[PDB]
Design a protein around this ligand. Sequence first.
Ligand SMILES: Nc1ncnc2c1ncn2[C@@H]1O[C@H](COP(=O)(O)OP(=O)(O)OP(O)(O)=S)[C@@H](O)[C@H]1O
Ligand SMILES: Nc1ncnc2c1ncn2[C@@H]1O[C@H](COP(=O)(O)OP(=O)(O)OP(O)(O)=S)[C@@H](O)[C@H]1O
Lengths: 247, 140, 439, 315, 260
Amino acid sequence: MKCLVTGGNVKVLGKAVHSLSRIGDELYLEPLEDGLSLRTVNSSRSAYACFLFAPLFFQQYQALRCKILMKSFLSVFRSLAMVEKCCISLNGRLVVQLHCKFGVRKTHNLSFQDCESLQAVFDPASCPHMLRAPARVLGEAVLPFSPALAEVTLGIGRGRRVILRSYHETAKAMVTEMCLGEEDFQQLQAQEGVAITFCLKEFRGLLSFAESANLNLSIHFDAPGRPAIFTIKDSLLDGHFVLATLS
Amino acid sequence: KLWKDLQEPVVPDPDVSIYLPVLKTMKSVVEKMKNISNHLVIEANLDGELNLKIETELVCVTTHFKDLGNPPLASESTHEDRNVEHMAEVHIDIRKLLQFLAGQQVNPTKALCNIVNNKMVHFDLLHEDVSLQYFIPALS
Amino acid sequence: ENEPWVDKYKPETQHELAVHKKKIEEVETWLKAQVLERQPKQGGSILLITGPPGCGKTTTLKILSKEHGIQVQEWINPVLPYQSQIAVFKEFLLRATKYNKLQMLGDDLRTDKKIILVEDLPNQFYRDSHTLHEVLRKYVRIGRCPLIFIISDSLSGDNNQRLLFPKEIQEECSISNISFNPVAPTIMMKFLNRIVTIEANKNGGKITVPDKTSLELLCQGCSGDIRSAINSLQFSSSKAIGGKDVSLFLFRALGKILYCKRASLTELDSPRLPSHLSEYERDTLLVEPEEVVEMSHMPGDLFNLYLHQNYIDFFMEIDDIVRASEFLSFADILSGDWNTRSLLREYSTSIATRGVMHSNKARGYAHCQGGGSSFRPLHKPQWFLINKKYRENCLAAKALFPDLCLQTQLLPYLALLTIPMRNQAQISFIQDIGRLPLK
Amino acid sequence: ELPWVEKYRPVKLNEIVGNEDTVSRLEVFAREGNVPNIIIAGPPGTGKTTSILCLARALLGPALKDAMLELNASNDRGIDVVRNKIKMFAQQKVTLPKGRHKIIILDEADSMTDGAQQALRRTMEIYSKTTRFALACNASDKIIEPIQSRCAVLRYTKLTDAQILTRLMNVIEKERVPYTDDGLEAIIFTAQGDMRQALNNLQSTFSGFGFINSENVFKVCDEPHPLLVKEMIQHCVNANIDEAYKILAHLWHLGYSPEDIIGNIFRVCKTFQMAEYLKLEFIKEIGYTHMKIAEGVNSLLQMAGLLARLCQKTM
Amino acid sequence: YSLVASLDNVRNLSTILKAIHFREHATCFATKNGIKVTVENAKCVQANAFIQAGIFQEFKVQEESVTFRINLTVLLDCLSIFGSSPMPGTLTALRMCYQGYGYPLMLFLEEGGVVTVCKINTQEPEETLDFDFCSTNVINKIILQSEGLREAFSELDMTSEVLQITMSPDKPYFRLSTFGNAGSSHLDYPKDSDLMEAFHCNQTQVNRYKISLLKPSTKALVLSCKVSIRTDNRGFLSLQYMIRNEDGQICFVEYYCCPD
DNA sequence: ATATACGGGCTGCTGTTGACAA
DNA sequence: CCCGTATATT
Ligand SMILES: Nc1ncnc2c1ncn2[C@@H]1O[C@H](COP(=O)(O)OP(=O)(O)OP(O)(O)=S)[C@@H](O)[C@H]1O
Ligand SMILES: Nc1ncnc2c1ncn2[C@@H]1O[C@H](COP(=O)(O)OP(=O)(O)OP(O)(O)=S)[C@@H](O)[C@H]1O
């Protein structure tokens, strides 16, 4: 394994690492035959986030699977990704050598333990419904909500419109009924009342990474109980997020 | 049944009514004073002198303000036997004054302080069209 | 040759467990009656599992869950490199109770029923003990899948278990109970014999098999705990070891003190009372009071109170009672200050125990215990409630006639007051003190 | 350099002259290499820590620096940082040839709080396929039951005279010190079990005398106290106050505080061979006298009165 | 009245004192040339300052030198009692008087018509070590900038216990190592850069230092413009800083630490 | 004819130093 | 500690 990242890709790599840290507690590193894969899974295994990086830096695997505590990586790339080059290899130790301005070089040796291969099963083709929209609109749509919320419900109203609500399970709390218009979204294959209920934190990490170059999301929601899929496509970057729905 | 208990607090006859200084400097001084101790003494004079005093077993600090215009008092027949150099200072706990100074963000034009001898300090502010009445109990 | 014998001979099938069949059957019928009668409207529930360490509570549950195809959810404490610990715990609980796993890559797929197992409780739960009650109430309100709690307890020093579940949340939350017992000698004997036979059949070299005479010695000094027994067997088979400390189960220590197991005065050279102390001759004793009191892990001032509560019923004469009472009073005197209360405390307990033991001359004549000692339970001191009532009544007398002496001088006047006055909650207090039963 | 108590430390495992069973079993286990977690207990001055360190060094060899963890009482053992570091070391993977594992040693574990032990007991049952524990302590009642419930408890004992004499002879032969049999007997008598104390006493005697004659040993200081009180109690048993006061006067003129004497009197009295009535009364009188002494009124007259009251009981 | 001192820009003294503030007490030294405040900790680490007579406008001393011990936290709080964020155009003036032994220290502050009076009673003195680092036995010396190590020393607070400093003429010219829970972290600094004003190391030197003693150097590094590192034959470390004020003067702060 | 488990009684009444969660 | 009772097994 040998990767040499040069340019502004360091910032987007750090943002992806931050989103994964916001989702999961451990980081799975897997060199595939077509690039690098970063994987993370929630503690209760109710959410799964994967970033596949198309060959863009130097990718060359084999001369092959690891997992690391994620707080260490998060701290390293929060304090050391503001930096003109990055180098990643596998000695034996994981070297995260980081070239900097002038002649300063910083090296980071880390400890890893053997783990199994993590994967999931998603069927985007099997999903009837489909929704597409720019990420900025959705990010603006989730701003009025308080930062202490747990569950959010997405639905399609009567009249071809979207609706985001606040699911609550006599000292109650506030409720929100934010609504949008069909003229902002670009593609809707929906129905006359199909709605789903999911979490918020992983969605917030997804939106945080998706609010950089004005990317477009894609939601494939199905009947309640079945998982939802959030897919982000870019030039040289693929990402897929799988959540769970209340049944 | 509780409608009477939320009525506007009554304002007794103030022993001394004094114009207040700029709020930012007073807030900064009080904030720096919070570290040393949790007790403060406020003193109001008849010539527009406002004194903030703390006295510990190790350090004693006193801050003076002068040239504060005394508003024309309604009772003009009760000043022939009251010493101008006399004062009606009081002592309060510095935990509720700091909140009141920190909340404000703009300096109004109706900054008034009414001080009584026994157990009461009262603040009057008015900005644009909104009036604020502040009541801080004494006896820290 | 890379794992210990504890981790190498684990029970795969149910029949390889070292637990009595009835307990396994009870856990199994509870779990299977929950699974079979799983109503769609069934709410949450909490199961409590207790027992001394090293009996096999976790392994039997895991085996029974795997046999019937049940998903289990563990709870491992997160590792620090702002959010509170309780916040993380509640978030995990909500996620586990609400949603399910996705697909994984190779699992026991056909699952829609699961239980949550929590063993590694956080420290804040031990320090506070009041967040747990709110968490349990919320779970009972919003629970779907049952919650199983596993606790490890010893005979003396059980503060954590009673602090966590103080008989009130169990009563008002409808929590069940299942208690294990130490493994019987025969079961451990048969399993140890099987293990040593398996090692012997390995051959490889001429190694001395451990002697049989030490094999029951190994099981005798372990008190029904498999893991230390296997560890000691591994240590001893290299060519007694495993002296786990005992806790003595305080209610057993009280009986040991109060029953005075005596001997028939075997011929020895013990000193005798020469001429005039002929009424103080006693038979040989086979108990050390100091070790008994120390091993119960209790403060001395509490042991003396329990002895004072429970020592009367075992006596038959009055003079011995007088002597015992005098000894107890003298033991009390030595601890009445505050600066030197902890410098000298062993004297009081030792004096009280030895006085109560020696003063019983009726019982202390060897072959004179036939017959009696019926099925009698002990009790608890009554001084605590009376003292607390005295203190609260002190305050209720002071602050409300404040213009101890008031209870000693003014309260006699109150007792001879008996006239009404202008209040509502005070007439009840007046009628409280002054209406003691009297014919 | 170092004194004789820390320079003559064994480096191998057969130089230890303590117990014979546990040491041989530990040598066999070091030969094989599948040790479980162990807890060592016993009186001070034996060599528990020496045995543990020698076992670890024999197990690892050249990879001791990067595969061993040692923790002490001077080092902070709270809950947070210790649990974090322990989990880092347990989860971290290292390569070991056949059966050697990673070793975590926590010396004097009795000083840990309940929270530290309760957080530690989880890590000691999962990562057993790549790591193992080893604990040394003095009081074994401090360690909670669940931690003991999965460990092998090895209990040492106070050394006898033969092994002490053999190792002392080895030291003398190494250092070429002229000796005498009665002087060595006196040194062993002063030792009273602990071995580092014996070596320190011998070095102190040899410092500025050049001989280990008994007179030189007693002159350069020390002397054992309890056996004098043991005779005194026997004297007061038979109503011999005149003979009882002599030893008390000797001890008081020797320079011993009342509390130090009165504690030893109680300690010797508990483990004695008398009746029950006499033991009860003696304990009562000693308790009252100790309360009086602790209150501040300490002098020779109080001890004399205590002796008189003890002698009055037997008449 | 022994010594009296007056000034119109409290900020210079305030920042000089804040650059050395990590203990609770300090010892002063008033001499015909100026003040000198020093502090020590663990009998190994020692930090000292210097405020020459050029800064002052009204300075008066009597007879010989004057020594007294003062609490640093209270003095620093009293100095900056008018807010540590003045807009350009607002200044504060102070006057201080010390009337000999056995009497407190006066402090009269004024700004824009507001006048404050405070007193600090002093209980002196202590004893100071003799850390003589004259430039005669110094073997390794370097001078370098601050913006290079702003983040570097900011990226130095972990759960480690020892910091390793190695300097050699060749290969790792100036390398810092930190061994923690996760792993090693090297921060090599080469020569011929924008922050390498003079490299004159003679022989290789590798040493270990305690994090607890060397941590409070961050405050001196933040409010600085240049840093000089010196180490002698034995291995004692001397750090020299250079701070400037608004007027355009220069003051120095020195740190002395001992190796493990 | 012999080994093993139910039944009933416990959380409880001034000063100086130290660890934990925020 | 203490007494009496219901079930597995040879
Ligand atoms: N027949 C057996 N029955 C039970 N455990 C066995 C048996 N044979 C081997 N073991 C081993 O003993 C272990 C039992 O662990 P225990 O510590 O007794 O379980 P535990 O109930 O969780 O104890 P705690 O939690 O400390 S109260 C199993 O995990 C096996 O590794
Ligand atoms: N069994 C032994 N054989 C030989 N020397 C011993 C033995 N036990 C103790 N020593 C001596 O004791 C000296 C230091 O004792 P330690 O082994 O450090 O005591 P310890 O085992 O750590 O027990 P502690 O720490 O006092 S509770 C060594 O240098 C030895 O000379």
